[PDB]
Amino acid sequence: VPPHPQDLEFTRLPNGLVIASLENYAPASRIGLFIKAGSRYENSNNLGTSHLLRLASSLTTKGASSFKITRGIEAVGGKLSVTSTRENMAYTVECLRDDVDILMEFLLNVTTAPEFRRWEVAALQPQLRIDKAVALQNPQAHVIENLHAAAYRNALANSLYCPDYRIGKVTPVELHDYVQNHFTSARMALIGLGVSHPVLKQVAEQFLNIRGGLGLSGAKAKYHGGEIREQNGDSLVHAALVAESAAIGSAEANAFSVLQHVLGAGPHVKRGSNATSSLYQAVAKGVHQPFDVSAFNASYSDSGLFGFYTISQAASAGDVIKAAYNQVKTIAQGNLSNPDVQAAKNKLKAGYLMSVESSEGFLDEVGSQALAAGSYTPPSTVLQQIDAVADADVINAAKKFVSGRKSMAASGNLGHTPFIDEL
Amino acid sequence: TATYAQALQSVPETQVSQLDNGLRVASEQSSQPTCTVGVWIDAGSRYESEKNNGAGYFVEHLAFKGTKNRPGNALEKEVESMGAHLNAYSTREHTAYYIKALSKDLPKAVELLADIVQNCSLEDSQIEKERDVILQELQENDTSMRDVVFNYLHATAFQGTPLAQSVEGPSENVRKLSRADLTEYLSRHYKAPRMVLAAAGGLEHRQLLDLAQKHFSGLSGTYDEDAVPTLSPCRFTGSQICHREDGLPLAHVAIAVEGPGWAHPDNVALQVANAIIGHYDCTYGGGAHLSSPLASIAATNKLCQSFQTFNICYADTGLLGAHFVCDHMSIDDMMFVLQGQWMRLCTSATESEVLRGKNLLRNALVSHLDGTTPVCEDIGRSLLTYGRRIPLAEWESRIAEVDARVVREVCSKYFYDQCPAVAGFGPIEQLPDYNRIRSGMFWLRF
Amino acid sequence: MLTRFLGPRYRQLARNWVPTASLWGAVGAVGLVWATDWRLILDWVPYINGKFK
Amino acid sequence: APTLTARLYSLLFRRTSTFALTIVVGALFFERAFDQGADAIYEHINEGKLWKHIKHKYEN
Numbered sequence A: 001v002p003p004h005p006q007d008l009e010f011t012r013l014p015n016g017l018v019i020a021s022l023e024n025y026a027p028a029s030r031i032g033l034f035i036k037a038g039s040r041y042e043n044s045n046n047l048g049t050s051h052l053l054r055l056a057s058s059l060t061t062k063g064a065s066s067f068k069i070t071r072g073i074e075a076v077g078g079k080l081s082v083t084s085t086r087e088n089m090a091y092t093v094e095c096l097r098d099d100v101d102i103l104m105e106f107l108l109n110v111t112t113a114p115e116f117r118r119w120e121v122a123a124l125q126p127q128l129r130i131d132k133a134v135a136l137q138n139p140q141a142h143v144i145e146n147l148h149a150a151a152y153r154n155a156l157a158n159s160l161y162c163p164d165y166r167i168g169k170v171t172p173v174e175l176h177d178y179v180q181n182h183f184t185s186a187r188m189a190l191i192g193l194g195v196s197h198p199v200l201k202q203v204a205e206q207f208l209n210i211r212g213g214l215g216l217s218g219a220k221a222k223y224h225g226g227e228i229r230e231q232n233g234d235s236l237v238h239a240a241l242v243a244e245s246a247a248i249g250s251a252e253a254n255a256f257s258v259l260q261h262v263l264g265a266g267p268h269v270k271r272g273s274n275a276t277s278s279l280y281q282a283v284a285k286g287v288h289q290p291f292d293v294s295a296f297n298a299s300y301s302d303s304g305l306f307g308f309y310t311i312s313q314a315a316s317a318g319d320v321i322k323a324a325y326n327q328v329k330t331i332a333q334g335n336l337s338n339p340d341v342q343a344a345k346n347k348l349k350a351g352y353l354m355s356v357e358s359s360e361g362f363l364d365e366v367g368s369q370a371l372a373a374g375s376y377t378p379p380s381t382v383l384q385q386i387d388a389v390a391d392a393d394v395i396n397a398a399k400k401f402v403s404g405r406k407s408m409a410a411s412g413n414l415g416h417t418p419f420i421d422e423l
Numbered sequence B: 001t002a003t004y005a006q007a008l009q010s011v012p013e014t015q016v017s018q019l020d021n022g023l024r025v026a027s028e029q030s031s032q033p034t035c036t037v038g039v040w041i042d043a044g045s046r047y048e049s050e051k052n053n054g055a056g057y058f059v060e061h062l063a064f065k066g067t068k069n070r071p072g073n074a075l076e077k078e079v080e081s082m083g084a085h086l087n088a089y090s091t092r093e094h095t096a097y098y099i100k101a102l103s104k105d106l107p108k109a110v111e112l113l114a115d116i117v118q119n120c121s122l123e124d125s126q127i128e129k130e131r132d133v134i135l136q137e138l139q140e141n142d143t144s145m146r147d148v149v150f151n152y153l154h155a156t157a158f159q160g161t162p163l164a165q166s167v168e169g170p171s172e173n174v175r176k177l178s179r180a181d182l183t184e185y186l187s188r189h190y191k192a193p194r195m196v197l198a199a200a201g202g203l204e205h206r207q208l209l210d211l212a213q214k215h216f217s218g219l220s221g222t223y224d225e226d227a228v229p230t231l232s233p234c235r236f237t238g239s240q241i242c243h244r245e246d247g248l249p250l251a252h253v254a255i256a257v258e259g260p261g262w263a264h265p266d267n268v269a270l271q272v273a274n275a276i277i278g279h280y281d282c283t284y285g286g287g288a289h290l291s292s293p294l295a296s297i298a299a300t301n302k303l304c305q306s307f308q309t310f311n312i313c314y315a316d317t318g319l320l321g322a323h324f325v326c327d328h329m330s331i332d333d334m335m336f337v338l339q340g341q342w343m344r345l346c347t348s349a350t351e352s353e354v355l356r357g358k359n360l361l362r363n364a365l366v367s368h369l370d371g372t373t374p375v376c377e378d379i380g381r382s383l384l385t386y387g388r389r390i391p392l393a394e395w396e397s398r399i400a401e402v403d404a405r406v407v408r409e410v411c412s413k414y415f416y417d418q419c420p421a422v423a424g425f426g427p428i429e430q431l432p433d434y435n436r437i438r439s440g441m442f443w444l445r446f
Numbered sequence C: 001m002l003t004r005f006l007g008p009r010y011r012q013l014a015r016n017w018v019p020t021a022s023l024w025g026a027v028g029a030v031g032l033v034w035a036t037d038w039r040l041i042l043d044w045v046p047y048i049n050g051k052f053k
Numbered sequence D: 001a002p003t004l005t006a007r008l009y010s011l012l013f014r015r016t017s018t019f020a021l022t023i024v025v026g027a028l029f030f031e032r033a034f035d036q037g038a039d040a041i042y043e044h045i046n047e048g049k050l051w052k053h054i055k056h057k058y059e060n
Helices: A049-052 A066-075 A099-112 A118-135 A139-151 A174-181 A197-207 A251-263 A278-286 A318-331 A338-355 A359-372 A377-387 A391-403 B002-010 B055-062 B075-081 B103-120 B124-141 B146-159 B169-175 B179-189 B205-215 B266-277 B293-300 B331-348 B350-369 B372-385 B392-401 B403-412 B434-439 C007-036 D004-013 D016-045 D051-057
Strands: A009-012 A018-022 A028-035 A079-084 A089-096 A188-193 A224-229 A236-244 A290-300 A304-313 A404-414 B014-016 B024-029 B034-041 B085-090 B094-104 B194-201 B240-244 B251-257 B279-281 B306-315 B317-326 B421-426
Touching: A009 A197, A018 A197, A018 A359, A028 A099, A028 B350, A049 A079, A049 A089, A049 A174, A049 B124, A049 D016, A066 A079, A066 B350, A079 A099, A089 A099, A089 A359, A089 B124, A089 B350, A099 A197, A139 A224, A139 A236, A139 A304, A139 A404, A139 B350, A188 A197, A188 A359, A236 A318, A251 A290, A251 A304, A251 A318, A251 A338, A251 A391, A278 A290, A278 A318, A318 A391, A318 B024, A338 A377, A338 A391, A338 B075, A338 B094, A338 B279, A359 B372, A404 B146, B002 B392, B014 B205, B024 B372, B034 B103, B034 B306, B034 B372, B055 B085, B055 B094, B055 B124, B055 B179, B075 B085, B075 B103, B094 B103, B094 B372, B103 B194, B103 B205, B124 B169, B124 B179, B124 B205, B146 B240, B146 B251, B146 B317, B146 B421, B169 B179, B194 B205, B194 B372, B251 B306, B251 B331, B251 B403, B266 B306, B266 B317, B266 B331, B266 B350, B266 B392, B266 B403, B279 B293, B293 B306, B293 B331, B317 B331, B331 C007, B331 D051, B350 B392, B350 B403, B350 C007, B372 B421, C007 D016, D004 D016
Parallel strands: A018 A188, A224 A404, B024 B194, B240 B421
Antiparallel strands: A009 A018, A028 A089, A028 A188, A079 A089, A236 A304, A236 A404, A290 A304, B014 B024, B034 B094, B034 B194, B085 B094, B251 B317, B251 B421, B279 B306, B306 B317
């Protein structure tokens, strides 16, 4: 028998900063500062600066040393993490209830007072190589980075990871310039779980009144189209096929989200055949060896990418790509049942509700929402928003993918992997 | 605002009921729109003999592939269609099947779980398909150096006991285990007093109880019969397995002394001490300044890629120690520094670092029990191991009691002058001789 | 000037090593007494008596 | 746990300082008991013979 839960509280300040808080009566507190500071805000002169920044969070600040941040956080058993998308950086901080003040102080120091001392920055440069190396052990990382580089002229084309030529070459000035033009009131959101709204509001008004930076969600992402190919002989070919879709929190994005679950996202059953996954069944029909297919769905501030991702044997890749693409074509041609949209609606709704079950998933959703929309949209109006997607909308999203200029990235033995014009 | 202390009281009590066949049914209610439900069974590879080892693992492969009511793909079609997630795991001691679902879907989710447990339609052709799948999985697991060393450490620590065995079994078991072997396992082990229906989320305990009588009540109403089925203690050894492979680019080493079982109060202090030594890998921010002397020295002097401390619990025994991954020229230095930390904590642990370990454990415990799934696991697992749910405020009481004197007492008891089990895989020429590892388990100065 | 080593942790660290340092003195005292046949102390010891009567 | 090597280890051998203390205390009482025995064996195997057994013939 639980307590009747508190409502989330939400505040936009005149300077554009957004504060959102929830008092769950939990033993731990979670606090995030979400900043429109992701890799899309880099340009061709400063590539990788937001990677080194992501790695730089325990370097010395004004009255908190490197030693002090590490020791002080660890003394109370806390964490400090930094997570980045192409759009956002997110500085989050966890501890027990009683310890919020010290971790808040460390957070505000990291984000608004970093010193970027020449020698500390130097000792950190090799860490870019380690971090990139570890991430790029998953073939998916290569593919999705190449996919974005292929798709875009600009902004969203930039990698999450520093280009090799920039390792050792990103400077203290570039870090200072990056923080001073991106880490500003009108680009920030301060989210807190298990803190009071007055405490957060106070913290925001005292410590987070910055501006001398940029305004928009950027230089606008120009979708280009094209393909990037990486020879490996990796036994398996990873391919992704993609077209321009819809900006986040448009109605069309929900149509893409639902189509993604018609076609099939992740699995639901440990070791299952994926019976209601329409891409997986379509590939399974004419391919009798180990494979995978998922629908791919990446939505951004001013663009999106929808299509599918395949893993297959080198010789089978062409067949797997063609079976998958034909299955999408068949929904674009109108062969889509009302029960199939409804099951996809059920998977998406349940997926979203499970997404926000934990503190970590709740805070990230509230944080990104605050940056994308300027608002908090409760679970039941997200569910209402998903429900309003017509069958025709899902057909229309499939139509848009099939007719639209493609982007492709692939890696492996590519001797039987098709180019875009062969599809 | 509430304190940390107040916040632990406000965590709602786990409600427990016993069904008439002896199935325990337990729930922690929150406000959530989603839930996790599942069956935790007191079954795993420690119950298996030489001849049927890997059977439960084989059952795990078959559990979702059809029932007497839902043949073939019909079950997964129902789970998928409501947007549910159906998952399973097998350890040496526990089997679990659980559904992540919408809270409004708890009726069907309980109905499916019962159908999986009671009515596994292990069709001969299906068991043949799974033969090749498990065999490939064994080939896959061979490439994971972490999974191999921990299997090796079990195989040497528990030498000639059922705890020496892998969960998956040997390959000869995989290729010769029949349907009759599998149904015999099911008959002996999937019995109502040995399994728990756990739930966490937006549910009343009353309806969890209702559905339990609805779908589980035909299990042990008169099936309480045959040798039901005593475990017996496993002799820990103190020994070494060294798989020398210089073709692999990094050495894996796991080292453990014999821990006490699930029951023992000593676990809380051991966990504090393990938190002080902590974990590390190469992607941790700020290395030099880390509090753990091992983690700090390992980062600065490039002594490893990763290490982790552990305390694996079984019934009346366990494995307490550490594992690491390092370059061929670093094993000696790693082992030296690891052992020195164990020795330091036995002899000369101090108040301040124990507070840090205490705090790390409160933060780990609370951060772990976050989501319907980990809470449901904890309800299920705890009722098998402790027979209660131990509430969050009790753990805090047990953590708070630990000071430097306790860490020195409890570490000395398990670590000081004890024979370790040691497992080595990879480029391990520089892995110290066992006598010299034994000698690292005491100090001449003390 | 030695003020580095003065504080609550070093007070605990000294306290931990005290029974050990006491026992190492007790080792060394008996060892000196045994090696020299220290007549002053060994006259007390109720069975170790090389001197008659 | 009744057994005597166990209590020997528990009380005396577990700590290296106590181990050393039990050796040095052990060496004192061994030197007495061995020199007592080994002299008494040597004296008994040479029954008269030595000036210790002759002594009483030439006076006080």
